[PDB]
Amino acid sequence: RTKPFTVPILTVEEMTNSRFPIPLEKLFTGPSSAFVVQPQNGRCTTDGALLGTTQLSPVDICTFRGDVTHIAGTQNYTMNLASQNWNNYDPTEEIPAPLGTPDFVGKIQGVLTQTTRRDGSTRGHKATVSTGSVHFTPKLGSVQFSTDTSNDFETGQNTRFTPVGVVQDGSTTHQNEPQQWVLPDYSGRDSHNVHLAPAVAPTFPGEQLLFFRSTMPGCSGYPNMNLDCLLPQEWVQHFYQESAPAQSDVALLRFVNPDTGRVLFECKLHKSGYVTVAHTGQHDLVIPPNGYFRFDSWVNQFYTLAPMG
Amino acid sequence: KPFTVPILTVEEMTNSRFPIPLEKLFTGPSSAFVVQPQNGRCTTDGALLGTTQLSPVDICTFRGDVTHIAGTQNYTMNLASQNWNNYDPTEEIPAPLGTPDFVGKIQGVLTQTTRRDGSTRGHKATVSTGSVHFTPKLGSVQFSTDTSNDFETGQNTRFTPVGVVQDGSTTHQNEPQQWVLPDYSGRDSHNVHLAPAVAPTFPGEQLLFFRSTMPGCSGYPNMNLDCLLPQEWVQHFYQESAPAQSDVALLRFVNPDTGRVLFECKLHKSGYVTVAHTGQHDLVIPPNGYFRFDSWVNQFYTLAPMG
Ligand SMILES: CC(=O)N[C@H]1[C@H](O[C@H]2[C@@H](O)[C@@H](CO)O[C@@H](O[C@H]3[C@H](O)[C@@H](O)[C@H](O)O[C@@H]3CO)[C@@H]2O)O[C@H](CO)[C@@H](O)[C@@H]1O[C@@H]1O[C@H](CO)[C@H](O)[C@H](O)[C@H]1O[C@@H]1O[C@@H](C)[C@@H](O)[C@@H](O)[C@@H]1O
Ligand SMILES: CC(=O)N[C@H]1[C@H](O[C@H]2[C@@H](O)[C@@H](CO)O[C@@H](O[C@H]3[C@H](O)[C@@H](O)[C@H](O)O[C@@H]3CO)[C@@H]2O)O[C@H](CO)[C@@H](O)[C@@H]1O[C@@H]1O[C@H](CO)[C@H](O)[C@H](O)[C@H]1O[C@@H]1O[C@@H](C)[C@@H](O)[C@@H](O)[C@@H]1O
Ligand SMILES: CC(=O)N[C@H]1[C@H](O[C@H]2[C@@H](O)[C@@H](CO)O[C@@H](O[C@H]3[C@H](O)[C@@H](O)[C@H](O)O[C@@H]3CO)[C@@H]2O)O[C@H](CO)[C@@H](O)[C@@H]1O[C@@H]1O[C@H](CO)[C@H](O)[C@H](O)[C@H]1O[C@@H]1O[C@@H](C)[C@@H](O)[C@@H](O)[C@@H]1O
């Protein structure tokens, strides 16, 4: 027969958020018709086709590389993006934006570091990329950082953004940003995103998406730190390696507790890459820290999940 | 008491999101946008939701008194309710009943009667529902006009909606945005008491939308306007108040000339319809076709595909 499908045998705490480089913490479900679940990172079919902007490196998510150019009389820099290899980025390539680009609207704070090539001297500065900005145009090849210096970065020098966490302005409404479910305009104002991974939704009565959730570090104020992915990064990696052909619509997984030996809940892993459970309402799953998912079988869409207690 | 939908053709009915007639049925996928309109929201047993009300002519209008904002051609309107009484911002509604539920530039005519002598005026006026001054829930909206002089304070003023407008210099059909709720209480405000967002929740299903074409007044506007129930359905359900026997009412869309069934659909108790189709599709329907309620069914009834 065909190569058997599997998911990694890893606990939730053992795995990594696929939308920002931090560990998963906890599983969450809620209704999703009041927002658009259409993230671009962490997108992979069960048989291993990466969609959207999703790539394999769990550390390259939300990072940026290239050379900078100071913007006269401000503390801001434009970065001309390079690819991961440091090869020039191609804006004609059939993707929404550079792989790893952030897929939520918000202000990401991190550190911009630079090596001068002629002598190996080295600098680093606190820097913020605002993905909702008029100047956030990764698909065009340019992005802009606000920083705390006006003189120190040099032109024509390898520069890198390391993301750290998220920010919101305290004088406004608490948790008003980031908005994890609003994609940026990858090409700036008045232009359409292209080649997106499909939006997703539960398509069976009584079902909701299962999200794998982390808390982003916050750098200032009160910023909404929940960040939900559709697949752990290790799943993307796993599926990409294994490339097992989907035998039917849904892969039925059981979440098991090894201590009791008991099945805790069952979920559907849709072929095109997300998870749904049977439940109505918002719910932080309570799980044994060493519980894990295991694959049971390929079933039809119309298979009825036992309610998640 | 048996449930029913009114014996009306689509062309006989009215859009419940702007005061104009229905033209057609449209279906498509809707996971890439939030389907959460606040007008034309009613349960089958006749509970009105969101900002929905009964008058098809009072959708997208405002009433109240005006104030001029010095050195502009703009006026601020303090809203009254439909009855000309004080709008109570505490009331458990997203915004005054009949407020527009999409981000857009609506163009109309602001008109005024001076009570004491019966003199009157009309001026072209536009409301921008994504403006920072669009605060209908707070009791206050703002219009832009063609006079800096004419309107008087303390008098009864009425906005009549006429069409939507869009800025031609920008990319076409970029506005209005029918599926983005306005911020009813302004910037950094949570919408409250909203009618729930809706989605198909059955494999192979898509929402069915009752569509019109709003008139355009300028620019290259997106004139599509989709509503989940026709206003006459909302009115019918309010009257009949028929209790729901299950989760889903099965309607047949029937051609009475031939008596044949064109397609079937699910009318969910909370007030929206789905059909069994994958993809965008303009429906082709005989001009005197109408909807007929056939039975209650459970959530697992499979529809015959709509061709
Ligand atoms: C601020 C800085 O860059 N300091 C580094 C220093 O740079 C000075 C030396 O090159 C100096 C020679 O001793 O030349 C100076 O330039 C002239 C000015 O142009 C002139 O107007 C004025 O009259 O005099 C000065 C010099 O006297 C340079 O500014 O070189 C030092 C040795 O490389 C190096 O140790 C020093 O590195 C900095 O140390 C400061 C403490 O002063 C802080 O630690 C900074 O973190 C650090 O700079 C950082 O590393 C350096 C190498 C570089 O990569 C920076 O981008 C980075 O921020
Ligand atoms: C423009 C207007 O209001 N016209 C109406 C006119 O108003 C003028 C008369 O009150 C006039 C007395 O005959 O007083 C004028 O005020 C002074 C100025 O203040 C002064 O600076 C200048 O030196 O001289 C003028 C007067 O000579 C008023 O402007 O009253 C007329 C009788 O009521 C009335 O027929 C007329 O109504 C307007 O008719 C114009 C034609 O000129 C158009 O049809 C307008 O549609 C119309 O005004 C409209 O109806 C009136 C009653 C009012 O409700 C307006 O708000 C509305 O636009
Ligand atoms: C008045 C008008 O039509 N304005 C619109 C403008 O019209 C010019 C363009 O279509 C242009 C495109 O090449 O062709 C021009 O015609 C030629 C002729 O040779 C001659 O007229 C002139 O000498 O040379 C020009 C150029 O070769 C048209 O006059 O097109 C704009 C671009 O789309 C458009 O934005 C503009 O629309 C108007 O915008 C202004 C903003 O200042 C106002 O909002 C107007 O209300 C708006 O017009 C209204 O909306 C537009 C979209 C349209 O529906 C109109 O019918 C309506 O009045």
PDB file of N, CA and C in Angstrom, chain A residues 168-229:
ATOM      1  N   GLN A 168       2.044  47.373  22.134  1.00  0.00           N
ATOM      2  CA  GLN A 168       0.898  48.191  21.833  1.00  0.00           C
ATOM      3  C   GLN A 168       0.935  49.495  22.602  1.00  0.00           C
ATOM      4  N   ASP A 169       0.192  50.458  22.100  1.00  0.00           N
ATOM      5  CA  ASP A 169       0.250  51.747  22.694  1.00  0.00           C
ATOM      6  C   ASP A 169      -0.753  51.851  23.839  1.00  0.00           C
ATOM      7  N   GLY A 170      -0.188  52.031  25.024  1.00  0.00           N
ATOM      8  CA  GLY A 170      -0.917  51.923  26.271  1.00  0.00           C
ATOM      9  C   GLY A 170      -1.980  52.972  26.438  1.00  0.00           C
ATOM     10  N   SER A 171      -1.812  54.115  25.770  1.00  0.00           N
ATOM     11  CA  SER A 171      -2.781  55.209  25.877  1.00  0.00           C
ATOM     12  C   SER A 171      -4.129  54.820  25.176  1.00  0.00           C
ATOM     13  N   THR A 172      -4.090  53.801  24.323  1.00  0.00           N
ATOM     14  CA  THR A 172      -5.284  53.341  23.625  1.00  0.00           C
ATOM     15  C   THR A 172      -5.913  52.109  24.315  1.00  0.00           C
ATOM     16  N   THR A 173      -6.844  51.421  23.647  1.00  0.00           N
ATOM     17  CA  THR A 173      -7.522  50.239  24.214  1.00  0.00           C
ATOM     18  C   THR A 173      -6.630  49.011  24.379  1.00  0.00           C
ATOM     19  N   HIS A 174      -6.632  48.518  25.612  1.00  0.00           N
ATOM     20  CA  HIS A 174      -5.865  47.344  25.958  1.00  0.00           C
ATOM     21  C   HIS A 174      -6.285  46.181  25.073  1.00  0.00           C
ATOM     22  N   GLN A 175      -5.256  45.492  24.615  1.00  0.00           N
ATOM     23  CA  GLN A 175      -5.283  44.369  23.673  1.00  0.00           C
ATOM     24  C   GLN A 175      -5.791  44.677  22.271  1.00  0.00           C
ATOM     25  N   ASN A 176      -5.742  45.940  21.859  1.00  0.00           N
ATOM     26  CA  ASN A 176      -6.172  46.292  20.516  1.00  0.00           C
ATOM     27  C   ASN A 176      -5.235  45.882  19.405  1.00  0.00           C
ATOM     28  N   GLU A 177      -4.013  45.493  19.742  1.00  0.00           N
ATOM     29  CA  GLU A 177      -3.124  44.960  18.741  1.00  0.00           C
ATOM     30  C   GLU A 177      -2.105  44.055  19.404  1.00  0.00           C
ATOM     31  N   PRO A 178      -1.480  43.164  18.638  1.00  0.00           N
ATOM     32  CA  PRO A 178      -1.643  42.913  17.209  1.00  0.00           C
ATOM     33  C   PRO A 178      -3.001  42.353  16.870  1.00  0.00           C
ATOM     34  N   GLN A 179      -3.333  42.288  15.597  1.00  0.00           N
ATOM     35  CA  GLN A 179      -4.535  41.559  15.216  1.00  0.00           C
ATOM     36  C   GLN A 179      -4.115  40.299  14.460  1.00  0.00           C
ATOM     37  N   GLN A 180      -4.118  39.199  15.166  1.00  0.00           N
ATOM     38  CA  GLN A 180      -3.522  38.035  14.618  1.00  0.00           C
ATOM     39  C   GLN A 180      -4.292  37.542  13.412  1.00  0.00           C
ATOM     40  N   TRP A 181      -5.505  38.054  13.185  1.00  0.00           N
ATOM     41  CA  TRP A 181      -6.309  37.490  12.091  1.00  0.00           C
ATOM     42  C   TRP A 181      -6.555  38.450  10.972  1.00  0.00           C
ATOM     43  N   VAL A 182      -5.711  39.459  10.858  1.00  0.00           N
ATOM     44  CA  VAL A 182      -5.787  40.385   9.750  1.00  0.00           C
ATOM     45  C   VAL A 182      -4.435  40.310   9.010  1.00  0.00           C
ATOM     46  N   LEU A 183      -4.405  39.829   7.769  1.00  0.00           N
ATOM     47  CA  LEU A 183      -3.187  39.847   7.018  1.00  0.00           C
ATOM     48  C   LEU A 183      -2.801  41.294   6.713  1.00  0.00           C
ATOM     49  N   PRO A 184      -1.489  41.573   6.595  1.00  0.00           N
ATOM     50  CA  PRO A 184      -0.966  42.841   6.127  1.00  0.00           C
ATOM     51  C   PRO A 184      -1.249  43.024   4.670  1.00  0.00           C
ATOM     52  N   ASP A 185      -1.036  44.229   4.164  1.00  0.00           N
ATOM     53  CA  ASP A 185      -0.982  44.357   2.716  1.00  0.00           C
ATOM     54  C   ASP A 185       0.444  44.168   2.254  1.00  0.00           C
ATOM     55  N   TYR A 186       0.744  42.968   1.784  1.00  0.00           N
ATOM     56  CA  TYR A 186       2.089  42.642   1.407  1.00  0.00           C
ATOM     57  C   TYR A 186       2.711  43.587   0.360  1.00  0.00           C
ATOM     58  N   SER A 187       1.891  44.325  -0.383  1.00  0.00           N
ATOM     59  CA  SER A 187       2.421  45.242  -1.398  1.00  0.00           C
ATOM     60  C   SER A 187       2.036  46.654  -1.132  1.00  0.00           C
ATOM     61  N   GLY A 188       1.490  46.916   0.028  1.00  0.00           N
ATOM     62  CA  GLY A 188       1.162  48.257   0.394  1.00  0.00           C
ATOM     63  C   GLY A 188      -0.252  48.605   0.014  1.00  0.00           C
ATOM     64  N   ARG A 189      -0.657  49.799   0.427  1.00  0.00           N
ATOM     65  CA  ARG A 189      -1.990  50.342   0.188  1.00  0.00           C
ATOM     66  C   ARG A 189      -2.479  50.188  -1.247  1.00  0.00           C
ATOM     67  N   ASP A 190      -3.782  49.873  -1.362  1.00  0.00           N
ATOM     68  CA  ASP A 190      -4.421  49.677  -2.663  1.00  0.00           C
ATOM     69  C   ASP A 190      -3.602  48.643  -3.491  1.00  0.00           C
ATOM     70  N   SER A 191      -3.483  47.438  -2.944  1.00  0.00           N
ATOM     71  CA  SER A 191      -3.095  46.351  -3.802  1.00  0.00           C
ATOM     72  C   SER A 191      -3.486  45.060  -3.196  1.00  0.00           C
ATOM     73  N   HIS A 192      -3.639  44.068  -4.056  1.00  0.00           N
ATOM     74  CA  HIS A 192      -4.213  42.825  -3.646  1.00  0.00           C
ATOM     75  C   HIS A 192      -3.129  41.890  -3.258  1.00  0.00           C
ATOM     76  N   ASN A 193      -3.335  41.159  -2.178  1.00  0.00           N
ATOM     77  CA  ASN A 193      -2.449  40.070  -1.903  1.00  0.00           C
ATOM     78  C   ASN A 193      -2.585  38.981  -2.978  1.00  0.00           C
ATOM     79  N   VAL A 194      -1.548  38.208  -3.223  1.00  0.00           N
ATOM     80  CA  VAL A 194      -1.664  37.191  -4.279  1.00  0.00           C
ATOM     81  C   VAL A 194      -1.173  35.821  -3.809  1.00  0.00           C
ATOM     82  N   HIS A 195      -1.592  34.776  -4.495  1.00  0.00           N
ATOM     83  CA  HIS A 195      -1.155  33.434  -4.133  1.00  0.00           C
ATOM     84  C   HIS A 195      -1.303  33.101  -2.662  1.00  0.00           C
ATOM     85  N   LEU A 196      -2.398  33.486  -2.020  1.00  0.00           N
ATOM     86  CA  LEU A 196      -2.574  33.210  -0.602  1.00  0.00           C
ATOM     87  C   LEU A 196      -2.922  31.751  -0.336  1.00  0.00           C
ATOM     88  N   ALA A 197      -2.521  31.224   0.817  1.00  0.00           N
ATOM     89  CA  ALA A 197      -3.112  29.980   1.304  1.00  0.00           C
ATOM     90  C   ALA A 197      -4.631  30.204   1.568  1.00  0.00           C
ATOM     91  N   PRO A 198      -5.489  29.222   1.270  1.00  0.00           N
ATOM     92  CA  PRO A 198      -6.941  29.464   1.387  1.00  0.00           C
ATOM     93  C   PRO A 198      -7.333  29.875   2.791  1.00  0.00           C
ATOM     94  N   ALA A 199      -8.331  30.729   2.963  1.00  0.00           N
ATOM     95  CA  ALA A 199      -8.975  30.822   4.308  1.00  0.00           C
ATOM     96  C   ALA A 199      -9.597  29.467   4.715  1.00  0.00           C
ATOM     97  N   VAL A 200      -9.812  29.268   6.010  1.00  0.00           N
ATOM     98  CA  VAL A 200     -10.321  27.986   6.422  1.00  0.00           C
ATOM     99  C   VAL A 200     -11.449  28.175   7.393  1.00  0.00           C
ATOM    100  N   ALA A 201     -12.337  27.179   7.448  1.00  0.00           N
ATOM    101  CA  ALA A 201     -13.488  27.170   8.369  1.00  0.00           C
ATOM    102  C   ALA A 201     -14.020  25.752   8.678  1.00  0.00           C
ATOM    103  N   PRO A 202     -14.565  25.530   9.890  1.00  0.00           N
ATOM    104  CA  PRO A 202     -15.214  24.250  10.165  1.00  0.00           C
ATOM    105  C   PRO A 202     -16.330  24.020   9.163  1.00  0.00           C
ATOM    106  N   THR A 203     -16.489  22.810   8.659  1.00  0.00           N
ATOM    107  CA  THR A 203     -17.512  22.611   7.632  1.00  0.00           C
ATOM    108  C   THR A 203     -18.308  21.397   7.990  1.00  0.00           C
ATOM    109  N   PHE A 204     -18.676  21.261   9.255  1.00  0.00           N
ATOM    110  CA  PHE A 204     -19.467  20.167   9.772  1.00  0.00           C
ATOM    111  C   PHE A 204     -20.175  20.680  11.050  1.00  0.00           C
ATOM    112  N   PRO A 205     -21.440  20.274  11.295  1.00  0.00           N
ATOM    113  CA  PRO A 205     -22.211  20.770  12.437  1.00  0.00           C
ATOM    114  C   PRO A 205     -21.581  20.439  13.737  1.00  0.00           C
ATOM    115  N   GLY A 206     -21.463  21.436  14.599  1.00  0.00           N
ATOM    116  CA  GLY A 206     -20.951  21.165  15.908  1.00  0.00           C
ATOM    117  C   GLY A 206     -19.447  21.222  16.024  1.00  0.00           C
ATOM    118  N   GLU A 207     -18.769  21.511  14.911  1.00  0.00           N
ATOM    119  CA  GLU A 207     -17.322  21.520  14.843  1.00  0.00           C
ATOM    120  C   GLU A 207     -16.709  22.916  14.897  1.00  0.00           C
ATOM    121  N   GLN A 208     -15.523  23.006  15.501  1.00  0.00           N
ATOM    122  CA  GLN A 208     -14.781  24.246  15.554  1.00  0.00           C
ATOM    123  C   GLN A 208     -13.324  23.991  15.215  1.00  0.00           C
ATOM    124  N   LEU A 209     -12.581  24.991  14.774  1.00  0.00           N
ATOM    125  CA  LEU A 209     -11.164  24.773  14.599  1.00  0.00           C
ATOM    126  C   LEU A 209     -10.478  24.496  15.912  1.00  0.00           C
ATOM    127  N   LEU A 210      -9.479  23.604  15.887  1.00  0.00           N
ATOM    128  CA  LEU A 210      -8.552  23.497  17.012  1.00  0.00           C
ATOM    129  C   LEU A 210      -7.291  24.293  16.755  1.00  0.00           C
ATOM    130  N   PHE A 211      -6.928  25.209  17.639  1.00  0.00           N
ATOM    131  CA  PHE A 211      -5.777  26.056  17.411  1.00  0.00           C
ATOM    132  C   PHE A 211      -4.640  25.595  18.316  1.00  0.00           C
ATOM    133  N   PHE A 212      -3.398  25.709  17.883  1.00  0.00           N
ATOM    134  CA  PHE A 212      -2.303  25.468  18.757  1.00  0.00           C
ATOM    135  C   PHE A 212      -1.830  26.842  19.117  1.00  0.00           C
ATOM    136  N   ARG A 213      -1.796  27.158  20.407  1.00  0.00           N
ATOM    137  CA  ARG A 213      -1.645  28.509  20.885  1.00  0.00           C
ATOM    138  C   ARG A 213      -0.372  28.836  21.693  1.00  0.00           C
ATOM    139  N   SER A 214       0.200  30.021  21.452  1.00  0.00           N
ATOM    140  CA  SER A 214       1.314  30.487  22.284  1.00  0.00           C
ATOM    141  C   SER A 214       0.997  31.826  22.744  1.00  0.00           C
ATOM    142  N   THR A 215       1.738  32.251  23.731  1.00  0.00           N
ATOM    143  CA  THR A 215       1.721  33.614  24.198  1.00  0.00           C
ATOM    144  C   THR A 215       2.999  34.305  23.684  1.00  0.00           C
ATOM    145  N   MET A 216       2.830  35.350  22.881  1.00  0.00           N
ATOM    146  CA  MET A 216       3.993  36.106  22.380  1.00  0.00           C
ATOM    147  C   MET A 216       4.600  36.948  23.498  1.00  0.00           C
ATOM    148  N   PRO A 217       5.927  37.109  23.515  1.00  0.00           N
ATOM    149  CA  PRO A 217       6.397  38.055  24.501  1.00  0.00           C
ATOM    150  C   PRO A 217       5.870  39.454  24.160  1.00  0.00           C
ATOM    151  N   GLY A 218       5.599  40.273  25.169  1.00  0.00           N
ATOM    152  CA  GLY A 218       5.195  41.649  24.926  1.00  0.00           C
ATOM    153  C   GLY A 218       6.331  42.553  25.346  1.00  0.00           C
ATOM    154  N   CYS A 219       6.661  43.538  24.534  1.00  0.00           N
ATOM    155  CA  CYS A 219       7.744  44.428  24.846  1.00  0.00           C
ATOM    156  C   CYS A 219       7.341  45.730  25.498  1.00  0.00           C
ATOM    157  N   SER A 220       6.097  46.114  25.343  1.00  0.00           N
ATOM    158  CA  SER A 220       5.645  47.365  25.905  1.00  0.00           C
ATOM    159  C   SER A 220       4.114  47.458  25.840  1.00  0.00           C
ATOM    160  N   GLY A 221       3.560  48.027  26.907  1.00  0.00           N
ATOM    161  CA  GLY A 221       2.138  48.254  27.029  1.00  0.00           C
ATOM    162  C   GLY A 221       1.480  46.937  27.326  1.00  0.00           C
ATOM    163  N   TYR A 222       0.246  46.863  26.855  1.00  0.00           N
ATOM    164  CA  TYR A 222      -0.614  45.712  26.948  1.00  0.00           C
ATOM    165  C   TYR A 222      -0.953  45.231  25.551  1.00  0.00           C
ATOM    166  N   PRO A 223      -0.210  44.312  24.967  1.00  0.00           N
ATOM    167  CA  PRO A 223      -0.596  43.998  23.590  1.00  0.00           C
ATOM    168  C   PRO A 223      -1.199  42.606  23.676  1.00  0.00           C
ATOM    169  N   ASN A 224      -2.222  42.353  22.871  1.00  0.00           N
ATOM    170  CA  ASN A 224      -2.858  41.056  22.845  1.00  0.00           C
ATOM    171  C   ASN A 224      -1.848  39.988  22.416  1.00  0.00           C
ATOM    172  N   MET A 225      -1.359  39.199  23.356  1.00  0.00           N
ATOM    173  CA  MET A 225      -0.309  38.253  23.008  1.00  0.00           C
ATOM    174  C   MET A 225      -0.788  36.873  22.518  1.00  0.00           C
ATOM    175  N   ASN A 226      -2.087  36.594  22.473  1.00  0.00           N
ATOM    176  CA  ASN A 226      -2.437  35.277  21.906  1.00  0.00           C
ATOM    177  C   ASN A 226      -2.036  35.189  20.435  1.00  0.00           C
ATOM    178  N   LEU A 227      -1.477  34.054  20.060  1.00  0.00           N
ATOM    179  CA  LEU A 227      -1.104  33.773  18.684  1.00  0.00           C
ATOM    180  C   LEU A 227      -1.404  32.310  18.372  1.00  0.00           C
ATOM    181  N   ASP A 228      -2.379  32.063  17.494  1.00  0.00           N
ATOM    182  CA  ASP A 228      -2.848  30.727  17.196  1.00  0.00           C
ATOM    183  C   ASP A 228      -2.362  30.192  15.862  1.00  0.00           C
ATOM    184  N   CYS A 229      -1.757  29.027  15.853  1.00  0.00           N
ATOM    185  CA  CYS A 229      -1.434  28.518  14.553  1.00  0.00           C
ATOM    186  C   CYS A 229      -2.322  27.342  14.131  1.00  0.00           C
TER     187      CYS A 229
END
